mmCIF file of all heavy atoms in Angstrom:
data_model
loop_
_atom_site.group_PDB
_atom_site.id
_atom_site.type_symbol
_atom_site.label_atom_id
_atom_site.label_comp_id
_atom_site.label_asym_id
_atom_site.label_seq_id
_atom_site.Cartn_x
_atom_site.Cartn_y
_atom_site.Cartn_z
ATOM 1 N N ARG A 19 -2.743 -8.634 4.447
ATOM 2 C CA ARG A 19 -1.788 -9.326 3.585
ATOM 3 C C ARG A 19 -0.532 -8.443 3.479
ATOM 4 O O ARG A 19 -0.607 -7.365 2.877
ATOM 5 C CB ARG A 19 -2.430 -9.563 2.216
ATOM 6 C CG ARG A 19 -1.647 -10.447 1.240
ATOM 7 C CD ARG A 19 -2.032 -10.151 -0.211
ATOM 8 N NE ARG A 19 -3.508 -10.128 -0.410
ATOM 9 C CZ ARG A 19 -4.215 -10.638 -1.385
ATOM 10 N NH1 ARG A 19 -3.691 -11.367 -2.353
ATOM 11 N NH2 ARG A 19 -5.531 -10.438 -1.414
ATOM 12 N N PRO A 21 3.015 -7.092 1.903
ATOM 13 C CA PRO A 21 3.528 -6.974 0.565
ATOM 14 C C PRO A 21 4.202 -8.256 0.046
ATOM 15 O O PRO A 21 5.135 -8.751 0.662
ATOM 16 C CB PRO A 21 4.501 -5.794 0.554
ATOM 17 C CG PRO A 21 3.928 -4.909 1.666
ATOM 18 C CD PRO A 21 3.422 -5.941 2.681
ATOM 19 N N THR A 22 3.657 -8.782 -1.067
ATOM 20 C CA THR A 22 4.183 -9.967 -1.753
ATOM 21 C C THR A 22 4.046 -9.845 -3.255
ATOM 22 O O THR A 22 3.403 -8.932 -3.784
ATOM 23 C CB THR A 22 3.545 -11.238 -1.145
ATOM 24 O OG1 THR A 22 4.303 -12.360 -1.549
ATOM 25 C CG2 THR A 22 2.082 -11.457 -1.602
ATOM 26 N N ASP A 23 4.684 -10.787 -3.991
ATOM 27 C CA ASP A 23 4.656 -10.817 -5.424
ATOM 28 C C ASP A 23 3.334 -11.350 -5.958
ATOM 29 O O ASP A 23 2.783 -12.319 -5.430
ATOM 30 C CB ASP A 23 5.841 -11.639 -5.938
ATOM 31 C CG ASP A 23 6.171 -11.369 -7.420
ATOM 32 O OD1 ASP A 23 5.565 -12.008 -8.327
ATOM 33 O OD2 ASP A 23 7.079 -10.549 -7.679
ATOM 34 N N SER A 24 2.806 -10.753 -7.040
ATOM 35 C CA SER A 24 1.598 -11.166 -7.754
ATOM 36 C C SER A 24 1.768 -12.438 -8.592
ATOM 37 O O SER A 24 0.826 -12.860 -9.237
ATOM 38 C CB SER A 24 1.204 -10.051 -8.676
ATOM 39 O OG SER A 24 2.249 -9.813 -9.617
ATOM 40 N N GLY A 25 2.985 -13.000 -8.661
ATOM 41 C CA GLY A 25 3.380 -14.012 -9.660
ATOM 42 C C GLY A 25 3.817 -13.397 -10.976
ATOM 43 O O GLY A 25 4.197 -14.082 -11.895
ATOM 44 N N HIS A 26 3.744 -12.040 -11.105
ATOM 45 C CA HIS A 26 3.857 -11.269 -12.347
ATOM 46 C C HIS A 26 4.799 -10.065 -12.209
ATOM 47 O O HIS A 26 4.690 -9.101 -12.945
ATOM 48 C CB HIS A 26 2.447 -10.869 -12.833
ATOM 49 C CG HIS A 26 1.488 -12.051 -13.020
ATOM 50 N ND1 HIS A 26 0.723 -12.642 -12.036
ATOM 51 C CD2 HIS A 26 1.201 -12.674 -14.200
ATOM 52 C CE1 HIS A 26 -0.005 -13.592 -12.625
ATOM 53 N NE2 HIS A 26 0.250 -13.665 -13.932
ATOM 54 N N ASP A 27 5.699 -10.068 -11.215
ATOM 55 C CA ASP A 27 6.740 -9.051 -10.941
ATOM 56 C C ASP A 27 6.179 -7.713 -10.431
ATOM 57 O O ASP A 27 6.882 -6.695 -10.315
ATOM 58 C CB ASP A 27 7.679 -8.862 -12.168
ATOM 59 C CG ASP A 27 8.213 -10.189 -12.698
ATOM 60 O OD1 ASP A 27 8.779 -10.939 -11.868
ATOM 61 O OD2 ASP A 27 8.018 -10.491 -13.890
ATOM 62 N N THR A 28 4.882 -7.698 -10.102
ATOM 63 C CA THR A 28 4.164 -6.637 -9.410
ATOM 64 C C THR A 28 3.911 -7.058 -7.949
ATOM 65 O O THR A 28 4.019 -8.236 -7.604
ATOM 66 C CB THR A 28 2.838 -6.290 -10.122
ATOM 67 O OG1 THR A 28 1.969 -7.375 -10.110
ATOM 68 C CG2 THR A 28 3.031 -5.892 -11.573
ATOM 69 N N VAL A 29 3.640 -6.089 -7.084
ATOM 70 C CA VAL A 29 3.654 -6.205 -5.645
ATOM 71 C C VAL A 29 2.226 -5.929 -5.122
ATOM 72 O O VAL A 29 1.753 -4.789 -5.195
ATOM 73 C CB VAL A 29 4.648 -5.230 -5.015
ATOM 74 C CG1 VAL A 29 4.808 -5.505 -3.498
ATOM 75 C CG2 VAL A 29 6.035 -5.362 -5.652
ATOM 76 N N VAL A 30 1.567 -6.969 -4.643
ATOM 77 C CA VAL A 30 0.246 -6.914 -4.026
ATOM 78 C C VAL A 30 0.396 -6.820 -2.502
ATOM 79 O O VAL A 30 1.291 -7.440 -1.919
ATOM 80 C CB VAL A 30 -0.643 -8.126 -4.395
ATOM 81 C CG1 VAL A 30 -0.984 -8.115 -5.885
ATOM 82 C CG2 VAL A 30 -0.012 -9.496 -4.055
ATOM 83 N N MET A 31 -0.504 -6.068 -1.861
ATOM 84 C CA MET A 31 -0.665 -6.083 -0.397
ATOM 85 C C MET A 31 -2.114 -5.765 -0.022
ATOM 86 O O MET A 31 -2.915 -5.332 -0.854
ATOM 87 C CB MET A 31 0.328 -5.098 0.256
ATOM 88 C CG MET A 31 -0.116 -3.631 0.028
ATOM 89 S SD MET A 31 1.202 -2.399 -0.009
ATOM 90 C CE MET A 31 1.863 -2.778 -1.669
ATOM 91 N N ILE A 61 -0.584 -0.353 -9.980
ATOM 92 C CA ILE A 61 -1.205 -1.189 -11.023
ATOM 93 C C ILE A 61 -2.735 -1.213 -10.838
ATOM 94 O O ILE A 61 -3.479 -1.138 -11.815
ATOM 95 C CB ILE A 61 -0.622 -2.611 -10.976
ATOM 96 C CG1 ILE A 61 0.932 -2.676 -11.074
ATOM 97 C CG2 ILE A 61 -1.246 -3.525 -12.068
ATOM 98 C CD1 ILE A 61 1.522 -1.929 -12.297
ATOM 99 N N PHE A 74 -7.207 -3.244 -0.329
ATOM 100 C CA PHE A 74 -6.370 -3.939 -1.333
ATOM 101 C C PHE A 74 -5.605 -2.950 -2.244
ATOM 102 O O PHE A 74 -6.139 -1.911 -2.617
ATOM 103 C CB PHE A 74 -7.202 -4.895 -2.174
ATOM 104 C CG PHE A 74 -6.343 -5.677 -3.154
ATOM 105 C CD1 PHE A 74 -5.515 -6.688 -2.699
ATOM 106 C CD2 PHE A 74 -6.286 -5.265 -4.515
ATOM 107 C CE1 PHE A 74 -4.591 -7.309 -3.591
ATOM 108 C CE2 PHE A 74 -5.404 -5.887 -5.404
ATOM 109 C CZ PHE A 74 -4.551 -6.905 -4.936
ATOM 110 N N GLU A 76 -2.252 -3.008 -5.442
ATOM 111 C CA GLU A 76 -1.193 -3.559 -6.286
ATOM 112 C C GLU A 76 -0.378 -2.413 -6.953
ATOM 113 O O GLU A 76 -0.970 -1.447 -7.447
ATOM 114 C CB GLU A 76 -1.744 -4.489 -7.363
ATOM 115 C CG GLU A 76 -0.595 -5.250 -8.068
ATOM 116 C CD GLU A 76 -1.056 -6.240 -9.128
ATOM 117 O OE1 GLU A 76 -2.202 -6.741 -8.999
ATOM 118 O OE2 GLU A 76 -0.246 -6.501 -10.025
ATOM 119 N N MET A 77 0.956 -2.535 -6.911
ATOM 120 C CA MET A 77 1.928 -1.598 -7.447
ATOM 121 C C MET A 77 3.146 -2.318 -8.056
ATOM 122 O O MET A 77 3.351 -3.494 -7.804
ATOM 123 C CB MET A 77 2.342 -0.618 -6.346
ATOM 124 C CG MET A 77 2.752 -1.331 -5.038
ATOM 125 S SD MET A 77 3.546 -0.289 -3.758
ATOM 126 C CE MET A 77 2.148 0.701 -3.213
ATOM 127 N N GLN A 78 3.997 -1.621 -8.825
ATOM 128 C CA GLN A 78 5.272 -2.104 -9.276
ATOM 129 C C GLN A 78 6.406 -1.154 -8.879
ATOM 130 O O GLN A 78 6.198 0.057 -8.725
ATOM 131 C CB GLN A 78 5.234 -2.384 -10.782
ATOM 132 C CG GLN A 78 6.480 -3.146 -11.277
ATOM 133 C CD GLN A 78 6.251 -3.859 -12.616
ATOM 134 O OE1 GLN A 78 5.933 -3.260 -13.627
ATOM 135 N NE2 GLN A 78 6.396 -5.176 -12.626
ATOM 136 N N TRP A 95 10.252 -4.987 1.747
ATOM 137 C CA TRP A 95 10.012 -5.660 0.468
ATOM 138 C C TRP A 95 11.221 -5.675 -0.442
ATOM 139 O O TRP A 95 11.581 -4.691 -1.070
ATOM 140 C CB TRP A 95 8.788 -5.121 -0.235
ATOM 141 C CG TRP A 95 8.490 -5.835 -1.527
ATOM 142 C CD1 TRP A 95 8.634 -5.320 -2.756
ATOM 143 C CD2 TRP A 95 8.167 -7.269 -1.708
ATOM 144 N NE1 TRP A 95 8.397 -6.321 -3.700
ATOM 145 C CE2 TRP A 95 8.139 -7.535 -3.110
ATOM 146 C CE3 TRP A 95 7.947 -8.353 -0.846
ATOM 147 C CZ2 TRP A 95 7.902 -8.823 -3.634
ATOM 148 C CZ3 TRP A 95 7.742 -9.652 -1.362
ATOM 149 C CH2 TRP A 95 7.734 -9.879 -2.746
ATOM 150 N N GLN A 97 12.191 -6.495 -3.646
ATOM 151 C CA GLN A 97 11.483 -6.550 -4.925
ATOM 152 C C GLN A 97 12.273 -7.389 -5.951
ATOM 153 O O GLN A 97 13.497 -7.297 -6.044
ATOM 154 C CB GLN A 97 11.255 -5.115 -5.415
ATOM 155 C CG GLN A 97 10.754 -4.917 -6.860
ATOM 156 C CD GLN A 97 9.429 -5.562 -7.219
ATOM 157 O OE1 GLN A 97 8.882 -6.370 -6.474
ATOM 158 N NE2 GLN A 97 8.882 -5.240 -8.382
ATOM 159 N N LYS A 98 11.545 -8.125 -6.806
ATOM 160 C CA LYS A 98 12.060 -8.892 -7.947
ATOM 161 C C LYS A 98 11.304 -8.527 -9.229
ATOM 162 O O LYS A 98 10.111 -8.195 -9.195
ATOM 163 C CB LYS A 98 12.049 -10.390 -7.602
ATOM 164 C CG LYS A 98 10.705 -11.129 -7.759
ATOM 165 C CD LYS A 98 10.639 -11.956 -9.059
ATOM 166 C CE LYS A 98 9.374 -12.830 -9.146
ATOM 167 N NZ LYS A 98 8.199 -12.040 -9.554
#
Side-chain angles (χ1 to χ4, degrees):
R19 188 203 312 223
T22 196
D23 198 271
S24 62
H26 305 83
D27 311 306
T28 64
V29 189
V30 294
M31 74 209 74
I61 306 305
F74 182 74
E76 190 179 333
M77 50 169 70
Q78 190 159 60
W95 182 249
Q97 171 60 348
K98 81 102 173 79

